[PDB]
């Protein structure tokens, strides 16, 4: 069985170079072609290049020729992708992928096409520094009280880097929950919202707490969201 | 460079329907080395077809590939729930391999207008000196939707951002969230904050608003 394991997500400053590793086990590391494919957020797949270890035969896409180096370490069955002069547009998930084979086992005839993929590695090119988010309430509209559907949520803003996870009432509440993809603000920090719609009548027979977790900054907030009361 | 064109980029189909995806090459693909991959949100791509028509062991036989030269087709006999995803073709008939831009096969369902909600900034955030106004468009279909922010009826630009969820696995709708951000000081110079929504399911724009300090 062929399994490809890549190094963890990494934040890289503009202009720097990044190195992503891919450790293989199973089949044959040396005799099958290993390629690298990336995918920027919301975009398609793009073949960057590949390498055949046995004879160190590299093959790069013109678009990356001059900024890329792909190497293979046969003693550890590890392949490496190096990308220089990083720009924000290089922010993407990078995958290594090995050619598939025909027949039973994993030592049959190579098929060229990519049958084995690593889990991917998110590379974020930015000048931002790690930062925990503030978690603000999106209070249920008082102009919906009796009967109907009410909406409430939490605004998790100004954090870096990705990712942030959000659950409601420690996972007991999932129906009607929508946790949106984060957006990257002009400041270079992220922001996301999580909302849930519920029966207006439940605003008095149930509490709502969004559980926010941002591991990099060790921010772990359990924010209770309730109707806002105002005088006059 | 061989350009692979996948058109249309999106196919809205019903569960169980048949599906045919086209991949056209700018020039002949060497030895029919055309491959198809499937990719679901958050997951890595998965090989479905290689050599234009060969299906690896493990891949459901409801997927089949045909064609040669410059015209290829991926056929899905019947769409199971897990088949709604994105499909990419790739040519490797020459050293410079390329992928098509992909075709998203989503679930077609009855039109549904969005439920719109507007949230003023929390007092907690105000104390910090910033003001975020959020607008939620909930459970709508099709995906196309548009949001316009109006403060005292003045159209806003450059101060808002939005994102959309993936199609819901249960009711096949989409949801969108948009945030309008202003400094506390600027927030207090205006009175009416409104979110105007347009969608195929609305015969006319839907506006939700609140007045600062009310």
């Amino acid at each position: 069985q062929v399994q490809l394991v890549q190094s963890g997500a990494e934040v890289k400053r503009p202009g720097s170079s990044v190195t992503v590793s891919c450790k293989a086990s199973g089949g044959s590391f040396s005799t099958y072609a290993l390629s690298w494919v990336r995918q920027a957020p919301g975009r398609g797949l793009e073949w960057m290049g590949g390498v055949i270890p046995l004879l160190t035969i590299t093959n790069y896409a013109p678009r990356f020729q001059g900024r890329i180096t792909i190497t293979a370490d046969r003693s550890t069955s590890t392949a490496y992708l190096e990308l220089n002069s990083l720009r924000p547009e290089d922010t993407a998930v990078y995958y290594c992928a090995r050619e598939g084979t025909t027949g039973w086992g994993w030592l049959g005839k190579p098929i060229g096409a990519f049958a084995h993929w690593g889990q991917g590695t998110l590379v974020t090119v930015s000048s931002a520094s790690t930062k925990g988010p503030s978690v603000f309430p999106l209070a249920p509209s008082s102009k919906s009280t009796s009967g109907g559907t009410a909406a409430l949520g939490c605004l998790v803003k100004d954090y870096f880097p990705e990712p942030v996870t959000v659950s409601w009432n420690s996972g007991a509440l999932t129906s009607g929950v929508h946790t949106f993809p984060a957006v990257l603000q002009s400041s270079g920090l992220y922001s996301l919202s999580s909302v849930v719609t519920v029966p207006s009548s439940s605003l008095g027979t149930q509490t709502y707490i969004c559980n926010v977790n941002h591991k990099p900054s060790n921010t772990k907030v359990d924010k209770k969201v309730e109707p806002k009361s105002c005088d006059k | 460079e061989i350009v692979l064109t996948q058109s249309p980029g999106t196919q809205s189909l019903s569960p169980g329907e048949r599906a045919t995806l086209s991949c056209r090459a700018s020039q002949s693909v060497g030895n029919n080395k055309l491959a198809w991959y499937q990719q679901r949100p958050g997951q890595a791509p998965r090989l479905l077809i290689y050599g234009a028509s060969s299906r690896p062991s493990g891949v459901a036989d409801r997927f089949s590939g045909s064609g040669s030269g410059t015209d290829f087709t991926l056929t899905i006999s019947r769409l199971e729930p897990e088949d709604f995803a994105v499909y990419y073709c790739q040519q490797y008939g020459q050293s410079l391999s390329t992928f098509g831009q992909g075709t998203k096969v989503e679930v077609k369902r009855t039109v549904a207008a969005p439920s719109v909600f507007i949230f003023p900034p929390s007092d907690e955030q105000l104390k910090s000196g910033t003001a975020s106004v959020v607008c939620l468009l909930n459970n709508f279909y099709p995906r196309e939707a548009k949001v316009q922010w109006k403060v005292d009826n003045a159209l806003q630009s450059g101060n808002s951002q939005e994102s959309v969820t993936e199609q819901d696995s249960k009711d096949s709708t989409y949801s969108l969230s948009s945030t309008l951000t202003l400094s506390k000081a600027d927030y207090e110079k205006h009175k009416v904050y409104a979110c105007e929504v347009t969608h195929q399911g609305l015969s006319s724009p839907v506006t939700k608003s609140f007045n600062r300090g009310e």
Binding site: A33, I52, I57, N59, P110, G112 | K33, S97
Partner: peptide, 12 residues
């Protein structure tokens, strides 16, 4: 045409 993608086939 010398297809880099056909090299491992030749070697196999």
């Amino acid at each position: 045409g010398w297809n880099w993608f056909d090299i491992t086939n030749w070697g196999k």
